[PDB]
Symmetry: C2
Subunit: 253 residues, 2 copies
């Protein structure tokens, strides 16, 4: 296995892999981490032939109790589970107007002095409407994209690495401390600050930066957070349980 | 698979299965759900031959950063990794003087009234003393028992059940609300309640209360909290994440 890896280089024809989104003022990081990596994988699974942004709207509103409690938080493995069964329509970003269900919660500043509104506390969850936005060609039903299988990956570096290399990006989670919130670049290790909680993310590569091994990680706090919305985190010593909740799946053909 | 199951009667030769520990004033439930399930497994796998209380003290204090922040909380999957690599010594309950390193943190009252002092959040992590207590027949390095494997179990009801039924109780986790804290009897469904955090526990069976399918769970809050130390929580609904984070392993024997 190579000394570093990027899903975006390895599968450059797939655009969603370089994309960064915004969950807004809603705790849908469980939903985002999932729908991001599904998009990457549908594309990867099809040599590019299929290129869908899978909807964060669909999963967040329509999943139910299995995924947890919506904008108040949720469970990744419920996400991929719902995907293998009820499956997931496409949906661009806020006012993208692409696919079936574009995401309907606005972008905001996540701990950064920008020009968009302040995010403020987890939004409330919207209802589930089994119908694509008006203008979209096919219906919700016909627009579903299915998972064939989903699974948890074990706490083993080499294993989480083999998975990203062979099947594309995965979903992870980790404890979040205050000192995280103002990350800018380099490799995040924890030193200071209080607990804030788990928070789900999409892992898309690994590498070494000045002696230090890392996971390359996409956050859903838009691109003016961190390193263009991405970040690196210590790899190897379960740092913040980053290696404890890897979940993944294979798209149906 | 059976419609009902109890590891406690499946392997009645295996006493640790029926035992409720007390974690005391320390957030070491991640440690307690693992050594508990590990003991159960060492007993089941050697068919009776080896019977030990695996030490909570050793895990909690000597595992380090791969497991978390000790008494402030940690990560089940880093516990089972530790076992497979560095091993765990024998330790019974507080003032048992059984085994190498018995637990050094006092039993207390956990969201109940009782004869014992109230628990506290304030819980320092005892240091990693790599010495068996005085009297113990065998030295610390000698008394270590090792994991052969550690693995995450996928979010599948039918798959979780079959792991237990074929291999022993498991460790797992769920999101705790405040309505949980005052449970007594019956099957847990989260109705009301506010969010309090994760809780790592040990699952040892399943069944059906009045139509309601549930999982049999050992808490580590002593026996006067709840149903003699155990509780039932609903099944098949990833309810409060119960089917989301299951970890296990096979003893080296």
């Amino acid at each position: 296995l190579p000394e570093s890896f990027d899903a975006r280089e390895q599968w450059s024809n797939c655009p969603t892999i370089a994309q960064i989104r915004d969950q807004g003022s809603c705790g849908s990081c469980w939903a985002f981490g999932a729908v991001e990596a599904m998009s990457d994988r549908i594309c990867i699974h099809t040599n590019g032939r299929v290129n869908v942004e899978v909807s964060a709207e669909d999963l967040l509103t329509c999943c139910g109790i299995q995924c947890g409690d919506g904008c108040n938080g949720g469970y990744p493995s419920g996400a991929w589970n719902f995907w293998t069964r009820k499956g997931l329509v496409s949906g661009g970003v806020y006012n993208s107007h692409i696919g079936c269900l574009p995401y309907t919660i606005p972008p905001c500043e996540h701990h950064v002095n920008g020009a968009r509104p302040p995010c403020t506390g987890e939004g409330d969850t919207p209802k589930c409407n089994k119908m694509c936005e008006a203008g979209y060609s096919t219906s919700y039903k016909e627009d579903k994209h299915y998972g064939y299988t989903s699974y948890s990956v074990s706490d083993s570096e080499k294993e989480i690495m083999a998975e990203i290399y062979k099947n594309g990006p995965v979903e992870g989670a980790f404890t979040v401390f205050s000192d995280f919130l103002t990350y800018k670049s380099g490799v995040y290790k924890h030193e200071a600050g209080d607990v804030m909680g788990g928070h789900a993310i999409r892992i898309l590569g690994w590498g070494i930066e000045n002696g230090v091994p890392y996971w390359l990680v996409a956050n859903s706090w838009n691109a003016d957070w961190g390193d263009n919305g991405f970040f690196k985190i210590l790899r190897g010593e379960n740092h913040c349980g980053i290696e404890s909740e890897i979940v993944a799946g294979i798209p149906r053909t």
